[PDB]
Amino acid sequence: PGIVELPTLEDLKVQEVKVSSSVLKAAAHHYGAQCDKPNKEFMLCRWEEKDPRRCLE
Amino acid sequence: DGPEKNYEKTMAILQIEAEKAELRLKELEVRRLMRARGDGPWYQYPTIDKALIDHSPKTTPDN
């Protein structure tokens, strides 16, 4: 019943963060303090839409 | 006593019994329909209450 829609692989292409987990943990506090606005916007969108396909941007 | 007493007593009794018979037939039909469909107060089997659901963020966006 119905056909699922999935974004094309060109829509999932982005410059990945290629640092390991320890590097991320070292600067986790400053990253959370400085980069808070896009992270919070993304997480609110994720919790409200309940759909990974509506939060690519 | 006179015949009118028995006459009218019989008439009242006949009315009462006829009404009771019609009511019994109506009750049987109503019960049959109510059990078949389930849209009346009778035969309302319980379902899960919806007040038990938790509506809160669940540590995972997709619930």
Phi-psi region of B49 (alpha: psi -120 to 50; beta: other; left: phi over 0): beta
CA distance A49 to A54: 7
Q: How far is B53 from chain A (nearest CA, A)?
A: 18
Angstrom resolution of this structure: 3.3
Looking at beta carbons, which pairs linking B14-23 to residues 24 or more positions away fall under 8 Å? none
Task: Locate A57 and state its tokens.
Answer: 């941007």
The H helix count followed by the E strand count for chain A is 3, 0
Elucidated via: cryo-EM
Q: How far is A50 from chain B (nearest CA, A)?
A: 5
The length of chain A, given as a count of residues: 57
DSSP 8-state class, residue B38: -
Residue type, A20: S
Please report where in the chains the tokens 């019960």 appear, as a residue.
Answer: B31
Q: Are the Cβ atoms of A50 and B62 closer than 8 angstroms?
A: yes
Q: Which residues of A touch B63 (CB under 8 A)?
A: 50
